[PDB]
Design a protein around this ligand. Structure first.
Ligand SMILES: *[C@@H]1O[C@H](CO)[C@@H](O[C@@H]2O[C@H](CO)[C@@H](O[C@@H]3O[C@H](CO[C@H]4O[C@H](CO[C@H]5O[C@H](CO)[C@@H](O)[C@H](O)[C@@H]5O)[C@@H](O)[C@H](O[C@H]5O[C@H](CO)[C@@H](O)[C@H](O)[C@@H]5O[C@H]5O[C@H](CO)[C@@H](O)[C@H](O)[C@@H]5O)[C@@H]4O)[C@@H](O)[C@H](O[C@H]4O[C@H](CO)[C@@H](O)[C@H](O)[C@@H]4O)[C@@H]3O)[C@H](O)[C@H]2NC(C)=O)[C@H](O)[C@H]1NC(C)=O
Ligand SMILES: *[C@@H]1O[C@H](CO)[C@@H](O[C@@H]2O[C@H](CO)[C@@H](O[C@@H]3O[C@H](CO[C@H]4O[C@H](CO)[C@@H](O)[C@H](O)[C@@H]4O)[C@@H](O)[C@H](O[C@H]4O[C@H](CO)[C@@H](O)[C@H](O)[C@@H]4O[C@@H]4O[C@H](CO)[C@@H](O)[C@H](O)[C@H]4NC(C)=O)[C@@H]3O)[C@H](O)[C@H]2NC(C)=O)[C@H](O)[C@H]1NC(C)=O
Ligand SMILES: *[C@@H]1O[C@H](CO)[C@@H](O[C@@H]2O[C@H](CO)[C@@H](O[C@@H]3O[C@H](CO[C@H]4O[C@H](CO)[C@@H](O)[C@H](O[C@H]5O[C@H](CO)[C@@H](O)[C@H](O)[C@@H]5O)[C@@H]4O)[C@@H](O)[C@H](O[C@H]4O[C@H](CO)[C@@H](O)[C@H](O)[C@@H]4O)[C@@H]3O)[C@H](O)[C@H]2NC(C)=O)[C@H](O)[C@H]1NC(C)=O
Ligand SMILES: *[C@@H]1O[C@H](CO)[C@@H](O[C@@H]2O[C@H](CO)[C@@H](O[C@@H]3O[C@H](CO[C@H]4O[C@H](CO)[C@@H](O)[C@H](O)[C@@H]4O)[C@@H](O)[C@H](O)[C@@H]3O)[C@H](O)[C@H]2NC(C)=O)[C@H](O)[C@H]1NC(C)=O
Ligand SMILES: *[C@@H]1O[C@H](CO)[C@@H](O[C@@H]2O[C@H](CO)[C@@H](O[C@@H]3O[C@H](CO)[C@@H](O)[C@H](O)[C@@H]3O)[C@H](O)[C@H]2NC(C)=O)[C@H](O)[C@H]1NC(C)=O
Ligand SMILES: *[C@@H]1O[C@H](CO)[C@@H](O[C@@H]2O[C@H](CO)[C@@H](O[C@@H]3O[C@H](CO)[C@@H](O)[C@H](O)[C@@H]3O)[C@H](O)[C@H]2NC(C)=O)[C@H](O)[C@H]1NC(C)=O
Ligand SMILES: *[C@@H]1O[C@H](CO)[C@@H](O[C@@H]2O[C@H](CO)[C@@H](O)[C@H](O)[C@H]2NC(C)=O)[C@H](O)[C@H]1NC(C)=O
Ligand SMILES: *[C@@H]1O[C@H](CO)[C@@H](O)[C@H](O)[C@H]1NC(C)=O
Ligand SMILES: *[C@@H]1O[C@H](CO)[C@@H](O)[C@H](O)[C@H]1NC(C)=O
Lengths: 346, 320, 66, 98
């Protein structure tokens, strides 16, 4: 580019653009303070300045002493608060250091500094991290952990509207910096929501998971009841007096003062799973995709049907097979199950 | 240094209460602004009576003294038909001239901001955090709900009931270091003269320097020129010049040698002063109207003249 | 445009203590507890060394600290 | 479920690249500060100490712009920093103080 101002051209792309001509700077001219000081007082003030420049360059930071703020802001055409973000995330490189003259009473040096300024497109301040918990399902004898694959990683809420962000190609220069940020919709079974895939995985019984939250509640997911907490569905739990649940102590939290909230409120969602999800997850021995949020009854069924049909009766494990058929039939036809179970044990 | 830090840090909301509502924030802000700032009110307005000041205790130029700002120099070269009476009124050339700005007829109050009149309780040897507590207690002990000091606090010069609880007494050498202080606050003018003539002391009447007057009186004041009665003409003064000696009165005052010292009192102001504390008014008013207002209100009162008293040099910060 | 982050004030509750000593209470949980009142500090009072120095020697000592 | 993410998030539009050349010269600093030949030696030791330390941990990198030696602003500010107040006077013919 021929001018810093040219960086704001609307029909440029996302890349690196270099200013064509070097910026030439004499320190004598930059440091006014020293000019009016005398003797060793002048010498010690310069020492402090040179030692600070060295400290910044080792950390790959920019010392903004040697560049006018008014000039840079005028050229970039940004607000006071944008400039603060721009100056915090910029990074430096020292590409040469050369001594140009060396007498016993006189010296001269040259330094080549190369700067890379990230120009922001959007800045996001009020942000939450997603934590997938899921749900337990007990199917034809097998316990199974079920999870939704959400198309976002961050929820943002600046004022009243909630926003779901998908990030790509991110690094950390104090703040998080990303090349790609796509805005998405939460999962659902409708034309105006995302059609997300659903994963299942077989787990060992008994299953217990208790996470202490920071505000003093507890997050519980468990295959069995204790302290009146229902099984299989997860929940946020709070108690008015210290007690032992799932073999550990749930304490009463310290009274808090109420402030203005920014907590997100996701939409609710019903989800229909295949009847034999437990047998499908068991014969894979890995975490496997079983449906989408917004799938039809017909497509969902024609998905493990051929696989499942070919688990046929064999000469070598008829009793072990007959016991599976019963566990599979129990909810459909309880009379038949009790019969099959009998012919199993015979 | 502060601006550089300001320029890379955005703001963040922190979920505690406003500092402006907390005592420790109100008490430490009023202190940092108005700790040593006071207001004095004369019984009625009365200014310093003369434009000339005889003060031989101060050593003349020949460390730097503050009173040298008011010192009339005796010059050898003058214009034709030049007389002191034309320029410096009734002042004695080689002494001190008090300007008309320090002698206003309508000035009713004196506002000052310095820690150089405190009695022996205050010591710079002690710690800042002690010297804070010490003052903060005394000001609480010497007040009762308003910002008016109790008469006990004042020196015996300013009140009949004064016992030097807060302020010390102004002495003879204070004029040299702190001129405006004395000229605006002293109740009476005391002289200190080694000039041949004062109190009818004649050269015969005395019953290296030894027994001798500093400046003896000559026949008269005159000039002479050589066909150039404009720019450069010789001047013959009405008294002697102290440039050679310049330590005479200062060394005399300390009593290294005996000499015929002359001292005369002249009453200016009645010993019934009244003294307010701007630190105690800041604490009290901020409980009613809130600190943001009171701070801005009292900061303007320090700039009543057009130059803010709190930014003046510590020894010279006295205004009528 | 005027930025200001709610990154440390996002949840809409706050648990406060009346003394630093209260942090060692045995029946507290693992969370963030804020001391209720701000700590007010004057630099003049903190930096003793400078108090007894004079002229530019005082000025250069403060520069190093800042 | 969710937890706070206190750090800001910036979306990148583009990157601007700059090259700055910093030129230091002790003699210019010694003239304004009225320094003596003893203190000139301190100034010189002090500046070398700091510059050398930086020189000793940084390898070179090629940057794809043109040579500074070809740019006006580099020629004008180098001639100034060396020869601003330097002049040559020529007598009509040689004649010394008598
Ligand atoms: C530690 O931290 C955790 C958080 O991590 C704390 O847990 C949280 O604690 C909160 C309390 O501070 C809980 O909030 C409360 O939720 C209640 C239940 O909300 C649901 O039901 C509501 C009522 O539903 C019935 O009735 C309506 C008619 O009135 C019928 O239509 C229904 O069919 C039902 O019969 C319902 O309004 C709510 O709906 C909202 O949320 C769901 C998703 O959860 C959305 O799908 C909805 O669209 C809707 O959200 C939108 O619309 C509402 C307004 O309608 C907006 O507020 C939203 O922003 C959004 O736009 C739920 O289905 C509430 O009853 C309860 O209300 C109180 O507060 C309001 C004011 O805000 C008052 O008006 C009320 O009178 C009442 O006092 C409150 O909101 C959180 O649920 C809980 N979070 C989790 C994840 O569990 C925990 O406490 C902390 N622990 C400690 C120790 O500190
Ligand atoms: C601003 O205001 C302050 C007051 O806060 C003022 O400081 C005071 O200044 C006065 C005058 O200099 C000081 O008083 C003088 O002290 C002299 C020394 O005191 C010692 O000796 C006496 C005994 O002689 C002891 O009692 C005492 O304990 C000390 O040991 C003292 O010599 C002076 O006394 C002479 O002068 C007064 C004048 O009124 C007179 O009344 C006395 O009789 C006495 O005799 C006179 O002597 C002089 C020559 O010395 C002669 O000229 C005159 O004719 C004689 N008069 C007669 C009648 O014979 C006097 O008491 C006082 O200590 C200071 N106070 C403090 C607290 O330091 C400033 O000077 C003021 N500044 C300005 C610029 O206005
Ligand atoms: C996402 O959301 C979809 C939509 O809700 C869910 O799919 C639907 O599930 C429901 C509940 O299980 C099914 O309801 C049943 O509907 C039949 C009648 O179906 C016929 O008529 C429909 C008219 O709208 C039509 O859509 C159907 O078309 C589908 O099926 C045909 C044939 O296979 C196929 O060719 C098409 O391509 C479509 O796929 C079809 O013509 C009805 O008979 C059922 O009645 C029972 O239930 C009621 C209520 O309890 C009861 O009263 C009766 O006695 C009886 O017991 C029942 O209502 C619906 O068929 C499903 N629709 C589709 C399109 O599949 C899906 O499950 C959700 N997904 C997830 C992952 O959660
Ligand atoms: C479990 O959920 C319960 C709701 O079903 C929680 O009970 C609520 O807890 C709050 C705590 O702040 C109580 O508020 C107290 O109220 C009393 C006076 O009661 C009257 O006024 C309140 C409003 O202030 C009103 O809601 C009531 O109906 C009464 O008219 C005050 O003395 C306290 O200072 C405090 O303000 C609620 O009263 C209470 N609601 C109900 C319906 O019981 C309970 O805390 C939760 N338990 C756990 C373990 O988290
Ligand atoms: C380095 O040394 C030089 C040489 O002494 C300093 O220059 C001198 O600076 C003083 C103070 O600013 C000048 O004195 C004043 O000049 C003005 C204008 O004539 C006058 O109004 C004042 O009364 C006073 O005389 C002085 O002019 C000037 N030098 C000369 C020879 O005239 C310089 O300040 C020093 N640099 C420092 C301390 O960084
Ligand atoms: C800032 O300047 C003031 C004013 O000169 C300095 O205060 C003075 O400090 C000296 C040395 O500590 C004091 O001198 C000594 O006083 C004691 C007690 O009377 C005495 O025993 C000694 O023989 C000596 O005279 C002096 O009292 C004091 N000022 C006055 C007017 O009395 C202050 O130290 C300076 N601040 C600095 C360098 O940070
Ligand atoms: C103290 O009071 C003086 C006199 O009112 C103020 O002087 C004015 O300052 C402003 C600055 O913008 C000028 O525009 C005016 O022309 C000044 N007037 C005069 C007569 O000088 C001064 O600003 C006040 N200072 C403080 C610190 O409040
Ligand atoms: C002082 O006050 C008097 C009486 O109010 C008044 O006449 C006069 O104008 C004021 N100013 C001066 C400079 O005398
Ligand atoms: C002598 O001193 C007195 C003091 O009251 C004065 O009135 C008188 O004029 C003086 N006389 C002479 C001749 O100086």
């Amino acid at each position: 580019l021929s001018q810093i101002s040219d960086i704001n051209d609307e029909n440029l792309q996302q890349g690196i653009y270099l200013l064509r001509d070097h910026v030439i700077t004499l320190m004598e001219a930059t440091l006014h303070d020293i000019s009016v000081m005398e003797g060793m007082f002048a010498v010690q003030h310069l020492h402090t300045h040179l030692n600070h420049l060295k400290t910044m360059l080792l950390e790959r930071r920019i010392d903004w002493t040697y560049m006018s703020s008014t000039w840079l802001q005028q050229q970039l055409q940004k607000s006071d608060d944008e400039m603060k973000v721009i100056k915090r995330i910029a990074r430096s490189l020292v590409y040469y250091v050369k001594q140009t003259h060396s007498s016993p009473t006189a010296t001269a040096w040259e330094i080549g500094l190369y700067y890379e300024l990230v120009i922001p497109k959007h800045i996001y301040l009020n942000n939450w991290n997603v934590v997938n918990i899921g749900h337990l399902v007990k199917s034809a004898g097998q316990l199974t952990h079920v999870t939704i694959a959400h198309p976002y990683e961050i929820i943002n809420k600046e004022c009243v509207e909630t926003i779901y962000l998908h990030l790509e190609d991110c690094t950390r220069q104090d703040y998080v910096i990303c090349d790609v940020v796509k805005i998405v919709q939460p999962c659902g079974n409708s034309s105006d929501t995302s059609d997300c895939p659903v994963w299942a995985e077989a787990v060992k019984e008994p299953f217990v998971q208790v996470n202490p939250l920071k505000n003093g509640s507890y997050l519980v997911l468990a295959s069995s009841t204790d302290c009146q907490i229902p099984p299989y569905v997860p929940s946020i739990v709070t108690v008015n007096e210290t007690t032992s649940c799932f073999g550990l102590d749930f304490k009463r939290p310290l009274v808090a003062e109420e402030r203005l909230s920014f907590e997100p409120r996701l939409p609710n969602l019903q989800l229909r799973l295949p009847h034999l999800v437990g047998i499908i997850a068991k014969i894979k021995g890995i975490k496997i995709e079983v449906t989408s949020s917004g799938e039809s009854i017909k497509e969902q069924i024609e998905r493990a049907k051929a696989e499942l049909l070919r688990l046929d009766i064999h000469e070598g494990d008829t009793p072990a097979w007959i016991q599976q058929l019963a566990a599979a039939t129990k909810d459909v036809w309880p009379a038949a199950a009790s019969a099959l179970q009998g012919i199993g044990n015979f | 240094e502060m601006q550089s830090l300001s320029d890379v840090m955005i703001d963040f909301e922190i979920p505690l209460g406003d500092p402006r509502d907390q005592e420790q924030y109100i008490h430490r802000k009023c202190y940092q602004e108005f700790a040593n700032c006071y207001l004095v009110k004369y019984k009625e307005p009365k200014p310093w009576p003369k434009e000339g000041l005889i003060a031989d205790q101060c050593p003349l130029p020949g460390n730097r003294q503050s009173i040298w700002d008011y010192y009339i120099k005796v010059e050898s070269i003058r214009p034709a038909n030049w007389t002191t009476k034309s320029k410096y009124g009734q002042a004695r050339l080689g002494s001190f001239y008090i300007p008309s700005s320090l002698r206003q007829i309508n000035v009713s109050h004196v506002l000052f901001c310095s820690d150089q009149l405190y009695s022996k309780w205050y010591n710079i040897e002690n710690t800042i955090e002690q010297n804070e507590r010490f003052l903060l207690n005394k000001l609480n002990n010497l007040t009762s709900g308003t910002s008016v000091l109790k008469k006990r606090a004042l020196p015996k010069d300013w009140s009949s009931q004064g016992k030097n609880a807060l302020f010390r007494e102004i002495n003879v050498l204070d004029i040299c270091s702190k001129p405006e202080s004395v000229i605006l606050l002293n109740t009476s003018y005391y002289s200190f003269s080694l000039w041949e003539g004062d109190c009818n002391f004649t050269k015969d009447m005395i019953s290296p320097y030894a027994c001798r007057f500093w400046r003896s009186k000559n026949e008269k004041e005159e000039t002479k020129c050589r066909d150039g009665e404009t720019k450069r003409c010789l001047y013959y003064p009405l008294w002697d010049s102290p440039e050679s000696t310049y330590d005479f009165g200062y060394l005399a005052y300390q009593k290294n040698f005996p000499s015929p010292i002359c001292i005369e009192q002249q009453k200016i102001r009645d010993q019934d002063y009244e003294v307010y504390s701007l630190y105690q008014e800041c604490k009290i008013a901020s409980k009613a109207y809130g600190i943001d207002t009171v701070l801005f209100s009292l900061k303007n009162f320090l700039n009543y003249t057009g130059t803010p008293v709190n930014e003046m040099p510590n020894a010279r910060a006295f205004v009528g | 445009a005027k930025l200001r982050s709610m990154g440390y004030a996002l949840t809409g509750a706050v648990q406060t203590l009346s003394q630093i000593s209260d942090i060692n209470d045995e029946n507290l949980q693992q969370g963030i507890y804020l001391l209720r009142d701000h700590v007010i500090t004057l630099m003049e009072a903190t930096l003793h060394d400078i108090s007894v120095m004079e002229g530019m020697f005082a000025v250069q000592h403060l520069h190093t600290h800042l | 479920y969710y937890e706070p993410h206190p750090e800001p998030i910036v979306v990148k539009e583009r990157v601007l690249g700059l090259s700055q050349i910093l030129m230091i010269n002790s003699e210019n600093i010694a003239n304004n500060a009225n320094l003596t030949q003893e203190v000139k030696k301190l100034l010189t030791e002090m500046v070398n100490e700091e510059m050398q330390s930086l020189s000793d941990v940084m390898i070179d990198f090629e940057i794809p712009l043109g040579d500074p030696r070809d740019q006006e602003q580099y020629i004008h500010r180098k001639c100034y920093q060396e020869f601003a107040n330097c002049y040559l006077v020529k007598y009509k013919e040689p004649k010394p103080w008598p």
